[PDB]
């Protein structure tokens, strides 16, 4: 059960979800909990005096906001999500996130296209570490763009290779992939000529 924190009745859903989960043993995720630091104090107190089910897991999503309660950080386990250190790490997370079945589909040329997408994503996202030179500003080139680009590759490759086991590299729609990424997927956030 996923609940976005921030509404008056959002807290009511969060309390009901946690009360039901600690007995059933399901998972509860509360997103943007940094927007209600005062309610986080009460959540920490409730969690401490609790004996939940073995399989119960509570996930809290925050923004690394200095207003997050200290006692909540001490009680929970902190996982920090950030750009990978380099190109090699960027490729590894890109390949790990994509299911193995998605890459291994009917055209054998899909794997190379995904690798090129993985490399292109790694290069432009690493250039963000050099703000004036790599780009003109800190663009939000993130996982959402990679998901859209991967969906674009899957849709267009299926359209051309209609069930063929192998496709000629010349028949791959390079113009479609290049234009869509430059205009819609990745070029949407770009505002500088």
């Amino acid at each position: 059960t996923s609940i976005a924190i921030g509404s008056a009745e959002g807290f009511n859903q969060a309390d009901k979800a946690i009360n039901t989960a600690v007995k059933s043993g399901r998972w509860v995720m509360l997103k943007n909990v940094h927007l209600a630091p005062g309610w986080l104090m009460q959540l920490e107190k409730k969690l401490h005096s609790l004996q939940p089910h073995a399989c119960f897991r509570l996930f809290l999503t925050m923004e690394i906001n200095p207003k997050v309660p200290v006692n909540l950080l001490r009680a929970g386990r902190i996982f920090v999500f950030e750009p990978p250190p380099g190109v090699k790490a960027n490729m590894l997370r890109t390949f790990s996130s994509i299911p193995v079945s998605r890459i291994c589909k009917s055209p054998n040329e899909r794997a190379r296209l995904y690798f090129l997408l993985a490399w292109f994503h790694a290069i432009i996202q690493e250039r963000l570490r050099y703000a004036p030179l790599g780009w003109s500003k800190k663009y939000e080139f993130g996982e959402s763009d990679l998901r859209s680009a991967c969906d674009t590759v899957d849709t267009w490759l299926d359209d051309t290779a209609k069930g063929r086991q192998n496709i000629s590299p010349d028949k791959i729609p390079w113009s479609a992939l290049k234009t869509l990424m430059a205009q819609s997927i990745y070029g949407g956030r770009v505002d500088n000529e």
Binding site: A4, I5, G6, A8, G10, L35, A176, L180
Partner: protein, 1622 residues
């Protein structure tokens, strides 16, 4: 003669005019002819107004009053009858038409049945006597209607649950307000009244078409008059239910449009694939079909032609049939261009422009295909384009047309969009279409972002209109909470409509995160709708919205347009940004927009003009000075282009007309060829861009125009007919008028420029410094246009910052979800309804106040092309074409570019209104308007003649005003503040002469004496109006400058400044020192609160304040705390017996509610025919509101004070707005007086220049050592008369007091500690302290007097000290001062190391020994342990000192304590111990976790009742930890100062209080009766019985913060720094 004729016409009209009654569904006879009845009453009232003006009104005075009283009752009664009749009609239809409401709302039906039967009974009574006079005189009919309206109001609100049930039946009802929905449901039988509600339910359907019986829906219509005829008309008889036949209309609308498109496609295929096209045939096809179908048919034909051509080029060597497609497009484009060049009907002209705009795009795309050598239909250069495919073999007409872009497939919704302004298909828009369609295919949302004016809202709407979808625009803000957005999503999901949430990021960050849950689940439902496994036979797809299953239509989409870094915006959460595909719309292709727009308008040189106008706008942005009201973006370019089309159209008509008078010749080709297209574009630029330019930027723009358009000159058309109208209006308003370079010439051009902006823009801004002639500009133009065009002009002036945003726009109840209209919403909704013919008048809504994005961005959709006001409850209000939203501001520093780009600015520089223009207006008013309400007028006319030479350019006043600006003042100087004070003071000179004439009936004032008095007073008036807010030496400095430049005789004193001289009524300068006598105060009134020793500064300021107060003019006294601002004002008010003063103490948390509570307590609201009037309860006395901390209230982040803006509105406009019912309340007999420290003091904010203009400021400085010696030498001499032996020491005692105070003031300043404020108040407390000690003493040796003198110095100058070295310095210097001024005395007997005085060990206040005092305190503490508190204490030397200090304060009237020290030091225990010793009852608030403001109010009332009514002394002990809210301090701030809280006792509490004050007065022996003196006695008792002890920790920043949140804590409380134990 004619007077009798007017009376006869009124009588014969009213005894013969019968109310118009018609049958209404064979139930009753309703009243019609409302406009005829209302205007007849108004025109007769105006005749009664002219009845009074004529001199012969004397004999006819009695008859006119009887008629006017009759008319007002007729006007008031029928104003309510029209309301109750309308409410009854739609309420009756709801309860009668639907039989299911009998069970859901049984009690509500029963109440309405009784109301309806009573209403129908009144219909029978009025039907018997249709005459207006007979129905008016019905017994209690007026009261019977007020209850009827209230009863209809109560039943109206209770139907909210029924309305929400009905919205589910027809989902489009969700975008209709509750009141409008009631009208639609109730009036289902009378469809004729539904024609004004279709525009809120459909994209372009403004009304339906009905047959003669009004029982069959023949078709629909648009706003422009375009009509669509249903193939199978919908019959209402077989589907009586309103939602049933409305649904059939919507379903028939789509099918009819689909069928019409198929026929249109068949016809347009002939024009396609044709080398030659007949213009006559093409025009006929355009006229036959609808605007959206003509463009759609052209798009389909071109798409099929290119698809056929590309398929034919499969081989690659097919001789490129794409050239044939390009040839046909150009040939058809040639025909369209020719058709526009000639005169066409307005509807066909719009169709041609739409066809040109699209065919230009089709030509551009085909050229790209030709250039790129595309020979395959699967090439992405063709796939990326938007292609329309038509399938005539498709059985379902709704699925015949398929729109595709890249890999996205769409279906035309066939929503009737009417005729919309189609956009130019720029490459950026193509990029927008590609990205948004890709987002739609992935079932995501679209989030275009960028700067303002780039075209994101229009592009989203254009794409929706391209697919035939219902696009709804919502102007998002912070009140779009989870419930409001969920209800909107429910409506969009069920309807199947696009939602464009513009300014989405303006929501709160927490609310944006919450909304992300609803968008996520909606998109998940959409995503699983696109699965091919889905079957329509199964249950329709649903999403969990607002804890309810909501069906999701596939056509629904969500779009959010936002500005990333603009002020007033929030940051979207990351989980929400992943639900939208963002696109950067930053640089619009304005070059192509200009070319296509001018090409479609008929310009021959569109390419040349576009290549000249777009760079001109870029150069203007890069060259002109950076001003806050400058916008050279696409909106400015769009406004120029549309004006160019309008200028050309009217120029062509004028040329065509001109040929008619000359003769007979009409040739479109010759007119088009001989047309100055260069001049037309420059005219539009000058009519739109010149008004906003500052003085130094105008030559830069004209130089740019000359360079870009060389050899082309513009001469503005002389609006002659308007200029006489302005000249006549200006003369009646005493306003100077000028032509060109004449005096007032610049102002008139601004008025004409503002007139042109009104004609072009529906949203205006008047940006310019305070007092630059802005209000007079639009006031004169509104009146001039009323005379010129004959259309009545009504202006609704609103101050947006004087009220909260909830009261300005409306609020949505979190619990009941009921929408309450705000100020602006009520005004706009009233005009839209036009119940009383508001739509037939020129309505202007003027926002007279500051502009910041918090409130002004809610008008983003109103000022945009939408012309729509969107509310959080889903209701939208279209701005009527006759309504102009106008802003009158002084700057645009805090306004974002989103609003600056939306309005046409008119810049009013301060040089527009020259000084002599104000001088002429003053003298014109003086010569015409009598001051009393003629001998008084004759004095004014004679005085004006004397002041004429001085009130000229380069005259005495103008030269003096110029010099006064060089000198610095306590407040920022403005021209109109000096002139406004000067004019009000010269009026008093005229009143002084009139008083002299009444005092000397036999010998009136002569001309020669009048010249002497007025000339001398004018010099006196200039000095005190220009340097009144400046220090003493610059009051002098302006004196010599006047002496150097004036010819008026001046005092011949070698060194005495002119500011020390007054003007006697005899016409001679006389010193102010002659009115300062060496008075002898009585002994019992020594240092009394109301005793004022007259000094030079006091008499000068008292006369100045009396002059301003006698004119009922607002004023502010500025000066250091304790300088004597309050004392001087109250002393001046004692000379005015008809003025009562009410004290208000402002703080950093002061809001207009504090003023409103005072108005409720001291004034009353009364209904008058002219409107609501707020006047004091007591008759004939003027109420004066004394605001003591006027500049303390906090400025928000946008630099405005809400209370100051409230006062500025309520001073300039003479009234405010009552937010209870959104009615204008006009003040009567209410005056405002302010006091404040200089703005350079910490915590003080400078007052707004638009407020200081109306308010003169006088600077009250600290008395000098000479003044202090005179003031307190008088007190010491009178006080020392108690002991005749000590009378010789009065002079040295005063010198010692002044000397020590001077050094203590210099040594300890606010820089060291915030509370180190030393004022003459300490000297007054010094005199009082010595007086009370000596009073009892029968005799005292000089040593005893010095010991008392030193003790008072220690208790006043050392108690507040913090550091030990400061206390050591005070101890040492007191010894030196006493020895310096009192030699040869026993220093040891006087300046002993411990100085303690107490009345505990004797009847008198004599010095006490430390050892003997300790034994007494030890003995009393032992008793204190068993009785009250058994906490052991330890007595050291500091405790004995501290208990004596607390005892001294507890014995004083209004004696409050401020104990500062570390916790655990005994501050509370010592306070309780001393209070028990002095008999006080200790009260502490038992604060807990759930303690709130209401609990504190109850505790405050409990203490006040005990200490005010029961005469019980109470030591209210309060700690800083008990302050859980700023509300606690605000109540304490007022209670400490005034001894009362105005809004504390209300309703039953006030009634219970008044009984208790009455009984308590009986015990005291006074039988007070009225509530006024009961409260005055109650306030006096609380003052003398309530002591408040405030304890807080010695914080650094907290003490400074408390110095502003609660100023009374440092001015009314005696501060003692306990600190830590040394």
């Amino acid at each position: 003669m004619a007077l009798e004729e007017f009376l006869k016409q009124i009588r014969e009209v009213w005894n013969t005019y019968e109310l118009d009654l018609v049958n209404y569904q064979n139930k009753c006879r309703l009243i019609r002819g409302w406009d005829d009845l209302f205007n007849k009453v108004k025109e007769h009232i105006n005749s009664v107004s002219a009845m009074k003006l004529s001199p012969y009104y004397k004999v006819f005075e009695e008859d006119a009053l009887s008629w006017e009283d009759k008319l007002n009752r007729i006007m008031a009664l029928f104003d309510v009858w029209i309301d109750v009749q309308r409410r009854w009609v739609y309420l009756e239809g709801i309860f009668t038409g639907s039989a299911d409401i009998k069970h859901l709302l049984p009690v509500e039906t029963q109440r309405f049945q009784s109301i309806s039967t009573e209403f129908l009974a009144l219909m029978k009574k009025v039907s018997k006597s249709p005459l207006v006079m007979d129905v008016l005189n019905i017994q209690g009919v007026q009261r019977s209607l007020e209850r009827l309206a209230d009863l209809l109001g109560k039943i109206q609100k209770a139907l909210g649950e029924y309305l929400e049930r009905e919205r589910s039946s027809f989902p489009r009802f969700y975008f209709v307000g509750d009141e409008d929905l009631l009208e639609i449901i109730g009036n289902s039988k009378n469809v004729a009244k539904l024609q004004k509600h279709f525009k809120k339910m459909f994209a372009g359907v403004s009304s339906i078409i009905l047959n003669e019986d009004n029982s069959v829906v023949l078709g629909i219509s648009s706003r422009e008059g375009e009509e669509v005829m249903f193939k199978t008309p919908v019959s209402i008889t077989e589907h009586p239910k309103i939602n049933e036949w409305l649904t059939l209309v919507e379903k028939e609308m789509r099918v009819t449009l689909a069928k019409l498109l198929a026929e249109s496609v068949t016809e347009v295929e002939i024009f396609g694939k044709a080398t030659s096209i007949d213009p006559n045939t093409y025009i006929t096809w355009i006229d036959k079909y609808q605007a959206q179908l003509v463009v759609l048919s052209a798009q389909i034909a071109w798409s099929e032609n290119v698809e056929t051509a590309l398929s034919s080029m499969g081989g690659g060597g097919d001789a490129a049939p794409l050239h044939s497609v390009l040839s046909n497009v150009e040939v058809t484009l040639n025909v369209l261009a020719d058709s526009v060049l000639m005169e066409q009907p307005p509807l066909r002209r719009r169709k041609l422009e739409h066809l040109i705009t699209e065919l230009v795009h089709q030509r551009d795309v085909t050229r790209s295909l030709i250039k790129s050598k595309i020979d395959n239909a699967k090439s992405f250069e063709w796939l990326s384009q938007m292609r329309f495919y038509f399938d005539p073999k498709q059985t379902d007409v709704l699925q015949q047309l398929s729109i595709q872009m890249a890999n996205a497939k769409f279906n035309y919704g066939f929503e009737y969009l009417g005729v919309q302004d189609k956009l130019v298909q720029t490459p950026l828009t193509d990029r927008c279409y590609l990205t948004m369609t890709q987002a739609l295919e992935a079932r995501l949302g679209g989030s275009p972002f960028g700067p303002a004016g780039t075209g994101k809202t229009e592009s989203v709407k254009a794409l929706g209109h391209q697919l035939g979808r219902f696009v709804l625009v919502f102007n998002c803000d912070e009140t779009f909470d989870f419930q409001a957005m969920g209800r909107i999503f429910v409506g969009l999901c069920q309807v199947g409509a696009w939602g464009c949430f513009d300014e989405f990021n303006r929501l709160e960050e927490r609310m944006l995160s919450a909304v992300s849950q609803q968008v996520q689940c909606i998109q998940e439902a959409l995503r699983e709708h696109s699965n091919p496994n889905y079957d329509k036979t199964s249950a329709p797809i649903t999403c969990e919205l607002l804890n309810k299953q909501v069906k999701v239509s596939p056509d629904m989409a969500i779009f959010i347009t936002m500005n990333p870094g603009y002020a007033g915006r929030s940051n979207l959460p990351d989980n929400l940004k992943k639900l939208f595909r963002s696109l950067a719309m930053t640089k619009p292709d304005r070059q192509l927009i200009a070319q296509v727009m001018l090409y479609s308008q008929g310009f021959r040189t569109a390419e040349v003009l576009a290549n000249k106008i777009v760079p001109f706008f870029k150069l203007c942005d890069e060259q002109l000075s950076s001003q806050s009201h400058y916008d050279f973006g696409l909106r400015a370019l769009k406004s120029v282009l549309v004006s160019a089309g309008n200028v050309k159209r009217e120029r062509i008509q004028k040329i065509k007309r001109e040929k008619e008078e000359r003769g007979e010749a009409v040739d479109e080709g010759e007119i088009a060829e001989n047309l100055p297209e260069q001049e037309i574009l420059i005219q539009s630029v000058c009519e739109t861009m010149v008004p906003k330019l500052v003085a130094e930027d105008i030559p830069l723009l004209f130089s740019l125009l000359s360079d870009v358009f060389p050899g082309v000159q513009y001469h503005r058309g002389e609006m002659t007919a308007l200029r006489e109208e302005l000249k006549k209006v200006c003369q009646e308003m005493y306003l100077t008028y000028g032509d060109g370079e004449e005096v007032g010439g610049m102002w008139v051009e601004k008025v004409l420029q503002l007139y042109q902006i009104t004609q072009i823009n529906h949203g205006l801004m008047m940006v310019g410094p305070s007092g630059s002639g802005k209000s007079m500009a639009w006031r004169v133009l509104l009146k001039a246009l009323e005379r010129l065009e004959g259309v009545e002009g009504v202006a609704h002036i609103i101050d947006p910052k004087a009220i909260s945003k909830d009261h300005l726009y409306g609020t949505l109840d979190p619990n009941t979800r009921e929408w309450t209209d705000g100020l602006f919403t009520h005004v706009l909704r009233k005009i839209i309804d036009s119940v009383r013919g508001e739509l037939q008048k020129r309505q202007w809504i003027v926002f007279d106040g500051d502009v910041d994005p918090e409130w002004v961005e809610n008008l983003n959709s109103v000022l945009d092309d939408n012309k729509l006001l969107t509310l959080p409850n889903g209701e939208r209000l279209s701005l009527p074409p006759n309504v102009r939203i106008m802003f009158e501001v002084q700057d645009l520093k805090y306004a974002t570019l989103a609003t600056v780009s939306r309005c046409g600015m008119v810049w009013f520089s301060e040089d527009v209104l020259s000084t002599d223009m104000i001088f002429n207006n003053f003298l014109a008013r003086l010569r015409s308007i009598p001051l009393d309400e003629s001998p008084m007028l004759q004095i004014q006319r004679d005085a004006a003649t004397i002041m004429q030479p001085y009130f000229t350019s380069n005259g005495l006043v103008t030269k003096a005003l110029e010099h006064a600006f060089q000198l610095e003042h306590i407040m920022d100087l403005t021209r109109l503040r000096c002139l406004g004070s000067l004019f009000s003071m010269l009026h008093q000179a005229c009143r002084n002469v009139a008083q002299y004439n009444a005092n000397h009936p036999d010998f009136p004032m002569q001309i020669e004496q009048l010249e002497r008095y007025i000339q001398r007073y004018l010099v006196y008036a200039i000095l005190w109006s220009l340097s009144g807010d400046s220090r003493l030496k610059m009051r002098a400095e302006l004196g010599e400058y006047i002496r150097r430049i004036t010819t008026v005789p001046l005092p011949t004193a070698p060194n005495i400044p002119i500011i020390d001289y007054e003007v006697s009524i005899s016409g001679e300068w006389s010193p102010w020192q002659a009115k300062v006598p060496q008075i002898e105060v009585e002994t019992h009134k020594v240092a009394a609160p109301d005793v004022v020793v007259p000094t030079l500064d006091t008499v000068r300021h008292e006369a100045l304040l009396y002059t301003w107060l006698a004119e009922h003019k607002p004023l502010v006294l500025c000066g250091p705390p304790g300088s004597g601002k309050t004392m001087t004002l109250f002393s001046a008010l004692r000379a005015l017996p008809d003025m009562e003063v009410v004290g208000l103490n402002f703080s950093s948390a002061t809001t207009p509610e504090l003023l409103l509570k005072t108005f409720d307590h001291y004034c009353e609201y009364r209904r008058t025919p002219n409107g609501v009037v707020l006047a004091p309860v007591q008759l004939g006395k003027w109420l004066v509101l004394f605001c003591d901390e006027i500049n303390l209230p906090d400025m928000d982040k946008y630099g405005t004070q809400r209370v100051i803006s409230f006062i500025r509105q309520m001073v300039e406009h003479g009234g405010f707005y009552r937010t209870s019912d959104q009615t204008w309340v006009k003040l009567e007999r209410i005056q405002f007086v302010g006091a404040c420290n200089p703005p350079t003091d910490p915590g003080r904010k400078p007052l707004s220049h638009r407020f200081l203009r109306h308010v003169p400021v006088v600077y009250v400085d600290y008395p000098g050592p000479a003044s202090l010696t005179q003031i307190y030498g008088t007190f010491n001499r009178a006080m020392l008369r108690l002991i005749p032996s000590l009378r010789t020491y009065a002079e040295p005692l005063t010198a010692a007091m002044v000397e020590f105070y001077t050094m203590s003031q210099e040594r300890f300043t606010q820089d060291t500690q915030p509370h180190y404020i030393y004022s003459p108040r300490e000297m007054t407390r010094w005199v009082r302290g010595i007086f009370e000690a000596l009073r009892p003493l029968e005799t005292l040796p000089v040593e005893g007097l010095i010991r008392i003198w030193a003790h008072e110095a220690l208790r006043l100058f050392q108690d507040r000290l913090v550091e030990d070295e400061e206390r050591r310095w005070t101890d040492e210097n007191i010894d030196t001062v006493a020895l310096k001024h009192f030699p040869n005395i026993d220093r040891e007997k006087a300046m002993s190391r411990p100085i303690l005085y107490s009345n505990w060990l004797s009847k008198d206040y004599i010095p006490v020994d430390q050892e003997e005092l300790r034994d007494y305190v030890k003995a009393r503490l032992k008793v204190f342990y068993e009785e009250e508190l058994d906490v052991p204490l330890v007595l050291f030397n500091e405790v004995l000192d501290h208990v004596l200090r607390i005892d001294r304060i507890f014995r004083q009237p209004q004696g409050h304590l401020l104990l500062i020290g570390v916790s655990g030091a005994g501050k509370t225990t010592l306070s309780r111990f001393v209070a028990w010793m002095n008999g006080l009852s200790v009260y502490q608030i038992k604060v807990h976790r759930k303690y709130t403001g209401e609990d504190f109010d109850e505790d405050l009332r409990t203490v006040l009742r005990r200490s005010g009514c029961k005469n019980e002394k109470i030591a209210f002990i309060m700690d800083e930890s008990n302050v859980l809210d700023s509300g606690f301090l605000e109540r304490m701030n007022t209670l400490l100062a005034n001894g009362e809280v105005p809004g504390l006792f209300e309703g039953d509490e006030y009634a219970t209080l008044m009984t208790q004050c009455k009984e308590g007065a009986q015990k005291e022996g006074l039988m007070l009766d009225s509530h006024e003196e009961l409260y005055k006695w109650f306030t006096s008792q609380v003052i003398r019985n309530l002591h408040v002890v405030f304890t807080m920790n010695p914080s650094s920043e907290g003490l400074k913060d408390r110095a502003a949140t609660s100023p009374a804590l440092f001015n009314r409380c005696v501060l003692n720094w306990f600190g830590d134990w040394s």
